[PDB]
Amino acid sequence: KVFGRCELAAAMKRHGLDNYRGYSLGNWVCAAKFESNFNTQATNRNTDGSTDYGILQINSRWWCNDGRTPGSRNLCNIPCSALLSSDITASVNCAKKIVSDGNGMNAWVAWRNRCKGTDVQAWIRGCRL
Ligand SMILES: [Cl-]
Ligand SMILES: [Cl-]
Numbered sequence: 001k002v003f004g005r006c007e008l009a010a011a012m013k014r015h016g017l018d019n020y021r022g023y024s025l026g027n028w029v030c031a032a033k034f035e036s037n038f039n040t041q042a043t044n045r046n047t048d049g050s051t052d053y054g055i056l057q058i059n060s061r062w063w064c065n066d067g068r069t070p071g072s073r074n075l076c077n078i079p080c081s082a083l084l085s086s087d088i089t090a091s092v093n094c095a096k097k098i099v100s101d102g103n104g105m106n107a108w109v110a111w112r113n114r115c116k117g118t119d120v121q122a123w124i125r126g127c128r129l
């Protein structure tokens, strides 16, 4: 599924991400924009053999099982395919664990490089939420 911006903002809010760990909704929407372009089906191979999955590009070394990532811990206890679903619940539940891992949203390099410090409220501007 390719979400619209406000549609994804609403779905994220519906799943408890607004201000989760202190990160406002616009931070999450911004991260999803630059990780996946709002496409739940996005997958991208990393240099190290792991793969990133879904709206928030969650990896298979630490967080989900894809069966092909040596050393996989599967800390979200889910198949990586579950992170490609139209229903963002699994991606949200796992993201909540990731952002609680110690470094906040810096876990997403694209958030650090493209969202952090910016006017992230712009991502929710105009949205009926
Ligand atoms: Cl915001
Ligand atoms: Cl933090």
Ligand SMILES: [Cs+]
Residues within 6 Å of the ligand: 019, 020, 021, 022
């Ligand atoms: Cs909070």
Ligand SMILES: [Cs+]
Residues within 6 Å of the ligand: 044, 045, 046, 052
């Ligand atoms: Cs990647």
Ligand SMILES: [Cs+]
Residues within 6 Å of the ligand: 035, 044, 052, 057
């Ligand atoms: Cs990525």
Ligand SMILES: [Cs+]
Residues within 6 Å of the ligand: 062, 101
């Ligand atoms: Cs990690």
Ligand SMILES: [Cs+]
Residues within 6 Å of the ligand: 073, 074, 075, 076, 077
């Ligand atoms: Cs596990």
Ligand SMILES: [Cs+]
Residues within 6 Å of the ligand: 101, 102
């Ligand atoms: Cs940790």
Ligand SMILES: [Cs+]
Residues within 6 Å of the ligand: 101, 102, 103
């Ligand atoms: Cs960490």
